[PDB]
Amino acid sequence: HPGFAMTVVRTDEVLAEHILYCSRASTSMFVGLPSVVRREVRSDAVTFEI
Amino acid sequence: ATLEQRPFPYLATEANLLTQIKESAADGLFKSFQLLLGKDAREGSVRF
Amino acid sequence: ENAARLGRQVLGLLPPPTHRVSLTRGPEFARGVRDLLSKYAASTRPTVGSLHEALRQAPFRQPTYGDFLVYSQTFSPQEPLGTFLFSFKQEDNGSSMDMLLTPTSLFMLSGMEAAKAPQTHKVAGVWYGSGSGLADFIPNLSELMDTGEFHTLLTPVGPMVQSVHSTFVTKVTSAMKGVGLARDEPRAHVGLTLPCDMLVDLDREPAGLNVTIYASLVYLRVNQRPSMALTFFQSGKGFAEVVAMIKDHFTDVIRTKYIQLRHELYINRLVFGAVCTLGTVPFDSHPVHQSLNSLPVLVFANFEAACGPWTVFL
Amino acid sequence: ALDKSIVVNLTSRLFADELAALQSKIGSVLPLGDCHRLQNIQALGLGCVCSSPDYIQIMQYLSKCTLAVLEEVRPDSLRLTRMDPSDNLQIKNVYAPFFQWDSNTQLAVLPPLFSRKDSTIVLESNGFDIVFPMVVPQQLGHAILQQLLVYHIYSKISAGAPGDVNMAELDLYTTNVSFMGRTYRLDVDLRVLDDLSMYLCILSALVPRGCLRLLTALVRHDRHPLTEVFEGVVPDEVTRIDLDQLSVPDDITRMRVMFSYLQSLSSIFNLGPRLHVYAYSAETLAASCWYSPR
Amino acid sequence: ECRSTNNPWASQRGSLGDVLYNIGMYSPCRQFFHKEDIMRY
Amino acid sequence: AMSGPAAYASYVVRGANLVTAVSYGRAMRNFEQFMARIVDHPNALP
Amino acid sequence: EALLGVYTNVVEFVKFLETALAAACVNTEFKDLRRMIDGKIQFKISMPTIAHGDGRRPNKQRQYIVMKACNKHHIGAEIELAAADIELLFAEKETPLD
Structure with a gap:
C-alpha cells in the first residue's frame, strides 16, 4: 500500500423514457396556404412539392 | 458625406429622421379593421 | 388611352401564379387539386395552344441552406447578421455538434498581432476572454501550423442567415449557394458582412457581371512560435492576376519568415498560404460602410455565394 | 420545370443475377456519352475507354464527359438522371471499397484503380460491362x-x-x-499508373537544369524581390550544373518538352468534376449535394 | 465549516488537477476542475 | 372520451361598417347595462 | 382458370386535429403570414392588486407591455403521380371512360 490514497471518477450513459406534461391552450397555431412547387418532370410520371 | 450627395437632399434628411421618431411599428399607420377569432373570441386571444 | 395598352403587356408577361391548395377545408381541397391536374394536362399535349402554355414558365432558382448546431462558448451572441462561416472537421467519431469559425473568432486561434489588425482585436477581446474556449477543442494549434494542414480542414460555407442563440447551444443557419435570403417568409437580403480591417481591396479596367471575394490563409511565425494570418481580398481581375497581386502584399512576410527559419528548414515548413473563392458580387453594387459596437463593417448587397477548393500559393 | 431523364433501353432482358447487382448501386454517378435521352447500353460507364486501363486518358475523359445518376432499374431497361451544373441531387454512398463520406465535404470524381470486382459489373445478357468511377472525398x-x-x-x-x-x-x-x-x-496485388510514373520521372531530371537555366537568363536590376529569397532553397549540387555541355538546339527541346509535362501533369490534378455535399446520413448512406464543373 | 478542505491536493489554486485537466478524445474529470467551464454552467 | 371542434378555427372580419350615427339615448341604455354587470357577473362581461 | 389471393395492408391515417395533442394548442385557420411585422405580436398585461387600507400597503398596479416573436416552421412533402392517370382523366374529347 503506497502512502497516498486516490479517488476515481466514472461516467455512465442511460437511455431514459420521459413524460411530457403540457397545459391547455399554451401555444397558438397558425396555418398558411401551402404552395405546390413542381419538380423532376418526366414522360413516365410527375413529382410535386408542398 | 452620403446624406447630401444622394439626390432629393431635403426629403433625404427628413425621411432619415424616422429612426428617431419611430417607437412602435404601427406608429404612422391608421387602424381600419379587426380580425377576431370568432364574434367576441376572447379578451385573451390574439386579435389582429 | 396609351396606358391601357401597357396594362396588357404587363398582364401578359407576368409569371403564372403559384397554385394554393388549402389543406384545412374539405371541399376547397377538391377544387384546388383539380386545377393542378386540369392545367398540367394541357401543358403536355402537342397542339399549339398547349405549347403556348409551356413557354410562360419562369424558372427562378432558390438557395440551398445549411443547418448547423454550435456550442455557444465558440460562437458569440454579438455577431453581425451576415458574418462568414468556416467549418472545421478534424475528428469524426463524436459527430455531436459542429464548430463554426467566424473571422473575428479565427483571429483568436491564430494569435496574430493587434498592430496588423488594430480595431478587430478590441472587439475580439470583449466577445471572447482569452481565446481559450475557442481553442479548448483543438489540441493541434501548434501542430497544424507546422505541418501546414489547417487550410485542408476548413470548408467555407456562407454568410449567417438565422441564429437562435441559447445559453448553451447555438443553432445557426447559413446560405451556401445563391443570393443569401432569410429563409423566413419576410425574405430580406441578408448580405455578407466583413469588417473593413480584414478586407484588402485591390483596385481603365473593364468590369463584368462579377467581382469575386477571395480568402487567403497565410502561415507565419510570430515570437518564434507558429501563428497564421487570414485576410480577405476583392478584385475582378481574373485568377492569373490576383495570385500575382497577393504575392506583392506578402513580400515582407515571406522575407521575414525564411530569415527566422534560415538554419532549420524542414520540408513541412515550406507550405505558405492558400486562396479560396468565397463568392461573387455584381458590379453596380458598392458596399456600404457600417459601424457596430465601434467596428467598421462593410455590407454587400446581392452577394451570391460559391465555393472553391484551397489552392496553395507561394 | 425541365426534363432530365435518360432512358437507357436494352435489347434483351437482364438476368436474375445481373438485375440484383444493379439494384444495389441505385444512387451512383455515371459518365455517359451524350446528353439526349434515348440511348443504348454502350453509352454508359467507363467501359468505352477502360474495358488494359490508362490513367490520364480516363481522367481527362471525366472532365469532358456528361455525368448522370441512376434512379431506377426495371428488368427490360434502365433509367438515369442527367446532372447539370449547380444542380441539386441526392447521391447514395454505394462505392466499393467503402470510404465513409462526411457532410460539408467536397467529393471528387476519380477513375477506378482497384480490382475488377469493386469497379465494374459484368453483364452477359448484352455483351457489355459497365464501369463505375471512383467517387472519393x-x-x-x-x-x-x-x-x-x-x-x-x-x-x-x-x-x-x-x-x-x-x-x-x-x-x-x-x-x-x-x-x-x-x-x-x-x-493492392499497377498498369493504371504507368502513365504518371513515366511523366513524373521524365520531369524529375529536367527541373534541376530548368530552374538554373531560367535563373541565369532572368538576372537584372528589375528582378522581382521574392526570387532573391528562393535563390537559396535550391541545393548546392543543382547550382554546379554546366549548361554549356548541351547544345543550343538541345536546350530548346528540354524546355518545350519540360513545360508540357509541367502543365499536363498539373492540369489533371486541378480537374474539377467535383460536387459539394451539404447533408449526409451515416446509416442511410443518402447524401444531398450540388454538382459543380471545373 | 469544521475544515476548509478535504484535500488541497486537488483543491489548490495551483493544484495539479488543474494542470492535468485543463488542456482529441473524452475528458471525464474536466467538468469539475476547469474554472472557466464552471462560468458557462 | 373528450370533445373538440371539427375544423380549425377561422378568423372573422369585423369593423367593416362602423355605423357612425350612434345616439345618446342608446348610449346611456348601453352604459347602464355595462356598469351593472360588475355587480352581477364580473367574469362574464359583453 | 384458378383464383389468386390478394391481401392489402390497412394503415390508420393521422389527422392532427383528432389526436389529443391539440388540447395543448389553439388551432387557428389563417390565410396569409406574408403580412406580419417581424418578431412582434405585442400583448399588454394588467395585473390587479388588493384594495387599500388598514395596514396593507401594496406595490400598486404594474403593467407590462411585452413584444414576443412568432417562430416559423418549415414542412416539406412530396407527391408522385403517374402521368397516365392525369392524362386519361382529362382529355379534349370529353366522351366517357370505360
Whole structure:
C-alpha cells in the first residue's frame, strides 16, 4: 500500500423514457396556404412539392 | 458625406429622421379593421 | 388611352401564379387539386395552344441552406447578421455538434498581432476572454501550423442567415449557394458582412457581371512560435492576376519568415498560404460602410455565394 | 420545370443475377456519352475507354464527359438522371471499397484503380460491362493516389535491383491511409499508373537544369524581390550544373518538352468534376449535394 | 465549516488537477476542475 | 372520451361598417347595462 | 382458370386535429403570414392588486407591455403521380371512360 490514497471518477450513459406534461391552450397555431412547387418532370410520371 | 450627395437632399434628411421618431411599428399607420377569432373570441386571444 | 395598352403587356408577361391548395377545408381541397391536374394536362399535349402554355414558365432558382448546431462558448451572441462561416472537421467519431469559425473568432486561434489588425482585436477581446474556449477543442494549434494542414480542414460555407442563440447551444443557419435570403417568409437580403480591417481591396479596367471575394490563409511565425494570418481580398481581375497581386502584399512576410527559419528548414515548413473563392458580387453594387459596437463593417448587397477548393500559393 | 431523364433501353432482358447487382448501386454517378435521352447500353460507364486501363486518358475523359445518376432499374431497361451544373441531387454512398463520406465535404470524381470486382459489373445478357468511377472525398482522393504513386515507383526499383527497397518498410507506410481520424487499408496485388510514373520521372531530371537555366537568363536590376529569397532553397549540387555541355538546339527541346509535362501533369490534378455535399446520413448512406464543373 | 478542505491536493489554486485537466478524445474529470467551464454552467 | 371542434378555427372580419350615427339615448341604455354587470357577473362581461 | 389471393395492408391515417395533442394548442385557420411585422405580436398585461387600507400597503398596479416573436416552421412533402392517370382523366374529347 503506497502512502497516498486516490479517488476515481466514472461516467455512465442511460437511455431514459420521459413524460411530457403540457397545459391547455399554451401555444397558438397558425396555418398558411401551402404552395405546390413542381419538380423532376418526366414522360413516365410527375413529382410535386408542398 | 452620403446624406447630401444622394439626390432629393431635403426629403433625404427628413425621411432619415424616422429612426428617431419611430417607437412602435404601427406608429404612422391608421387602424381600419379587426380580425377576431370568432364574434367576441376572447379578451385573451390574439386579435389582429 | 396609351396606358391601357401597357396594362396588357404587363398582364401578359407576368409569371403564372403559384397554385394554393388549402389543406384545412374539405371541399376547397377538391377544387384546388383539380386545377393542378386540369392545367398540367394541357401543358403536355402537342397542339399549339398547349405549347403556348409551356413557354410562360419562369424558372427562378432558390438557395440551398445549411443547418448547423454550435456550442455557444465558440460562437458569440454579438455577431453581425451576415458574418462568414468556416467549418472545421478534424475528428469524426463524436459527430455531436459542429464548430463554426467566424473571422473575428479565427483571429483568436491564430494569435496574430493587434498592430496588423488594430480595431478587430478590441472587439475580439470583449466577445471572447482569452481565446481559450475557442481553442479548448483543438489540441493541434501548434501542430497544424507546422505541418501546414489547417487550410485542408476548413470548408467555407456562407454568410449567417438565422441564429437562435441559447445559453448553451447555438443553432445557426447559413446560405451556401445563391443570393443569401432569410429563409423566413419576410425574405430580406441578408448580405455578407466583413469588417473593413480584414478586407484588402485591390483596385481603365473593364468590369463584368462579377467581382469575386477571395480568402487567403497565410502561415507565419510570430515570437518564434507558429501563428497564421487570414485576410480577405476583392478584385475582378481574373485568377492569373490576383495570385500575382497577393504575392506583392506578402513580400515582407515571406522575407521575414525564411530569415527566422534560415538554419532549420524542414520540408513541412515550406507550405505558405492558400486562396479560396468565397463568392461573387455584381458590379453596380458598392458596399456600404457600417459601424457596430465601434467596428467598421462593410455590407454587400446581392452577394451570391460559391465555393472553391484551397489552392496553395507561394 | 425541365426534363432530365435518360432512358437507357436494352435489347434483351437482364438476368436474375445481373438485375440484383444493379439494384444495389441505385444512387451512383455515371459518365455517359451524350446528353439526349434515348440511348443504348454502350453509352454508359467507363467501359468505352477502360474495358488494359490508362490513367490520364480516363481522367481527362471525366472532365469532358456528361455525368448522370441512376434512379431506377426495371428488368427490360434502365433509367438515369442527367446532372447539370449547380444542380441539386441526392447521391447514395454505394462505392466499393467503402470510404465513409462526411457532410460539408467536397467529393471528387476519380477513375477506378482497384480490382475488377469493386469497379465494374459484368453483364452477359448484352455483351457489355459497365464501369463505375471512383467517387472519393477530394483530400482523401489524392492521398489514396500519391501513396500508390509511391508504391508504383519503388516496386520498379526492386524489380531492377532488389537490394535497394525494403518490402517490410514499403507496405507499412503506403498501404495505410489516414484521413478524418480513420485508417483505410487499401487493396493492392499497377498498369493504371504507368502513365504518371513515366511523366513524373521524365520531369524529375529536367527541373534541376530548368530552374538554373531560367535563373541565369532572368538576372537584372528589375528582378522581382521574392526570387532573391528562393535563390537559396535550391541545393548546392543543382547550382554546379554546366549548361554549356548541351547544345543550343538541345536546350530548346528540354524546355518545350519540360513545360508540357509541367502543365499536363498539373492540369489533371486541378480537374474539377467535383460536387459539394451539404447533408449526409451515416446509416442511410443518402447524401444531398450540388454538382459543380471545373 | 469544521475544515476548509478535504484535500488541497486537488483543491489548490495551483493544484495539479488543474494542470492535468485543463488542456482529441473524452475528458471525464474536466467538468469539475476547469474554472472557466464552471462560468458557462 | 373528450370533445373538440371539427375544423380549425377561422378568423372573422369585423369593423367593416362602423355605423357612425350612434345616439345618446342608446348610449346611456348601453352604459347602464355595462356598469351593472360588475355587480352581477364580473367574469362574464359583453 | 384458378383464383389468386390478394391481401392489402390497412394503415390508420393521422389527422392532427383528432389526436389529443391539440388540447395543448389553439388551432387557428389563417390565410396569409406574408403580412406580419417581424418578431412582434405585442400583448399588454394588467395585473390587479388588493384594495387599500388598514395596514396593507401594496406595490400598486404594474403593467407590462411585452413584444414576443412568432417562430416559423418549415414542412416539406412530396407527391408522385403517374402521368397516365392525369392524362386519361382529362382529355379534349370529353366522351366517357370505360
